[PDB]
């Protein structure tokens, strides 16, 4: 079964983050979304353990 996430962040947000704290605001999201998938799976497994 599949699992996917989309961010599609704005231009202005990224420009602001670069201006505010030197951030790129793309990679950060890449990180967050990938992170969210790994963690979500981790939970799915744990929850299935309790489920069964």
């Amino acid at each position: 079964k599949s699992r996917q996430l989309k961010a599609a962040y704005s231009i202005e947000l990224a420009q602001d983050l670069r201006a505010v704290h030197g951030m790129d605001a793309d990679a950060e999201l890449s990180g967050i979304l990938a992170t969210e998938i790994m963690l979500e799976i981790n939970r799915e497994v744990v929850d299935w353990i309790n489920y069964s």
Binding site: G31, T35, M38
Partner: peptide, 11 residues
């Protein structure tokens, strides 16, 4: 690593 001079990374 691939994508010369890029930022290709994964978790």
């Amino acid at each position: 690593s691939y994508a010369c001079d890029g930022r290709m990374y994964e978790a």
